[PDB]
Ligand binder design. Structure first.
Ligand SMILES: [Cl-]
Ligand SMILES: [Cl-]
Ligand SMILES: [K+]
Length: 227
């Protein structure tokens, strides 16, 4: 059997998170089904998001299942599979705050972003004159905004929506998503990476056909986020 290592953070509800001392979520269920279909011994390695892409290049993991958005720079540095989730980058503020209607309102504000994430680069590209006070983190991002240490943060709409409705955090969506994001699994451009890529695309396409991918998405979001 082929050993495959899947990097994640364990702090990305409901994609990858811990509850009752169990590492679970959307990314966990998906790669267990992939491992059934390709004779993989899947091994989950939890690490902060800022170092997941580093672990991938060094070779201590084989891929990452953590909503890795495909970017122009990441295309040149890694291989990617077919996108399995499509969404948009969302600004989210504290509940009751109407002083921030979108990304153009961040001038002079403090916006939290995960370090090394596509949301940081997008935010720095949307900061032409240094108006925004970008604060980068790996944990406690949505908590600083709900408490007041940061004015807003930028993630995907899906995860923020579940924190607002399911979890119940005192947060609200700030406007409409300003950038579509296509999320796929990155691979190292080597023999095993090319081998995993082609075999994962065949499993991903096979899961979309029989509805298994939709079953996983409905369990973790109530909505088929694969569509
Ligand atoms: Cl990312
Ligand atoms: Cl900096
Ligand atoms: K991302």
């Amino acid at each position: 059997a082929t050993e495959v290592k899947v990097g994640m953070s364990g702090r990305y509800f409901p994609f990858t998170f811990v509850k009752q001392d169990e590492l679970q979520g959307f990314e966990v269920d998906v790669w267990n089904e992939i491992g059934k279909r390709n004779d993989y011994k899947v091994e989950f390695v939890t690490a902060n998001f800022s170092g997941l892409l580093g672990l991938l290049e060094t070779g201590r993991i084989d891929t990452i299942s953590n909503q890795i958005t495909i970017t122009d720079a990441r295309k040149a540095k890694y291989l990617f599979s077919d996108p399995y989730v499509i969404d948009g980058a969302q600004i989210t503020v504290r509940k009751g705050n109407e002083a921030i209607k979108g990304i153009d309102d961040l001038a002079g504000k403090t916006v939290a972003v995960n370090l090394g994430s596509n949301f940081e680069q997008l935010l720095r590209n949307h900061d032409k004159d240094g108006k925004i006070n970008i604060k980068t983190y790996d944990t406690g991002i949505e908590h600083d905004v709900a408490l007041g240490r940061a004015d807003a943060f930028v993630m995907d709409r899906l995860s923020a929506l579940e924190l607002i409705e399911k979890t119940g955090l005192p947060l609200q969506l700030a406007g409409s998503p300003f950038e579509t994001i296509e999320n796929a699994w990155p691979f190292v451009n080597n023999e095993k990476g090319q081998q995993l890529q082609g075999e994962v695309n065949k499993a991903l396409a096979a899961m979309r056909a029989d509805g298994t991918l939709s079953q996983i998405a409905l369990k973790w979001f109530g909505t088929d986020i694969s569509q």
